[PDB]
Design a protein around this ligand. Sequence first.
Ligand SMILES: N[C@@H](CC(=O)O)C(=O)O
Ligand code: NA
Ligand code: NA
Ligand code: NA
Length: 415
Amino acid sequence: MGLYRKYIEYPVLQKILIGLILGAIVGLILGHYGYAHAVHTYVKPFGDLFVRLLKMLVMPIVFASLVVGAASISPARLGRVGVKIVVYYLLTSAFAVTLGIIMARLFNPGAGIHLAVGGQQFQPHQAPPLVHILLDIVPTNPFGALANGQVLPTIFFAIILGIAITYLMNSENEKVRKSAETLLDAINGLAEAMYKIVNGVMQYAPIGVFALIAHVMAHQGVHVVGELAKVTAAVYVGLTLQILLVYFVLLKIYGIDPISFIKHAKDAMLTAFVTSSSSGTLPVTMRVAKEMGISEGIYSFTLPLGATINMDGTALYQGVATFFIANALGSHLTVGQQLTIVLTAVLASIGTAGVPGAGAIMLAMVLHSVGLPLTDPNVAAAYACILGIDAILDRGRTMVNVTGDLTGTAIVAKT
Ligand SMILES: N[C@@H](CC(=O)O)C(=O)O
Ligand code: NA
Ligand code: NA
Ligand code: NA
C-alpha cells in the first residue's frame, strides 16, 4: 500500500487537470490508429461507474440538507437593513443568468456533435398543462417521493418539516422539546455523513475524468475538441465582462473608490481561487471584515447569509451548460423555454452548498425543468462530457461568487 498512500496525499484539484490532459492525449493517439471498439468495451465502464456514483448521493443529500437548513433559520423580520440585504442578491442572480443567453448565442457552443448514442436523436415530449405541474409539487405520499426519485416533491416536504420542527424546540413541554432535538440531531448526522462520502468520490474523479474524456475523443474525433474549447473560453470572458458590467458600475455611481476596493480585497479572491471552496474560505472573509475599520454588527449576518444565497458564478455555469447540452442534442430552445431558464437557475443557485462540485450535482435539476431528464441516454452522454471538464471551470467561478459577497456587503455598509 506504499503507492496508495502517496496517491491519496496530493492536491485533488491538481490530479483532475493531470487526469484530463492525459485522457485527451490517449484518445486522439488511439483514434488516429483506430481501435474505436477497444476503448468502448474496456475503458468505458470506468466512466459509467463514476456517473453512477454521483447520482447515488444526490437524493439523500437534498433531503437532509434542507431540513437542517430550514430549521436553523428563524423569521426575525431581518430588522431594517436586512430587507435591503436579501433583495440585492436576488436581482443580481437574474442578471447573471440573463447574460448567459446572449453570450452563448455569440459563440454557439455544441454545434456539430450529432449525438446518436441511443440510435436516434432526442425527441422533445410535449409538456403537460401548467395546472398539472404545480399540483404535483405537493407529494401525495411523503415517502413515495424519495423512493421513486422525484426531487420537487421532496424539496416541498423537506422545507415544511424544518419549519414545523423549530416550533417544537420552542415548545414549553419538556418531552416534546427533547424529542425535537433528538430528531433534528439524527438528520443532522445523515447530512454530515453525506459530506464525507463526497470527499471519497472526489478521490476517484481523476480516474473517472480520464475514462470519460478518452471515450469521447475516440468516437467523435478531433472535431469535438474545438467546441470544448469554445465553452471553456466562453464562461471566463462572460464572467470577466460581468464583473465590469454590474460589480464595477455600482462602485462608480456610489462614493466607494473601486481601485482601492480591490487593493484591500486582493488577497481575498486569490486565497479563494487557490482553495476553490467558497463555503470553506469563510475565515479570510471575516479576516478582511474586521480590518475594514467599520462596524461589525452589519457583518454579523451578511457573511453567513451571503455564503449560500449569492452564487452568481455558478449561475452562469448552470445557464451555459443548459444551453450547450441542447445544441449537442440538436433540440433548439424556444422562447418560452428561455424564460423558464432564468427563473429556475436563480432559485437553483440559491440551493448550492458552496463546496466545489456542487454545481454539477444541482445542474441536472434545471435540466428537468427544461424537459431533458437524466434517464435519457442522449442526455446522459452530453452531461457526462461536462463532468470531466468541471474542475478547470470551477477554478474561475469561485472567484466571482466570493467577489460578489465582498462587494455586496460594502455597498450597503456605505448607506
Ligand atoms: N465551488 C463553487 C460552486 C461549485 O463548484 O458548484 C463556488 O463556490 O463558486
Ligand atoms: Na446573485
Ligand atoms: Na447557493
Ligand atoms: Na458566494
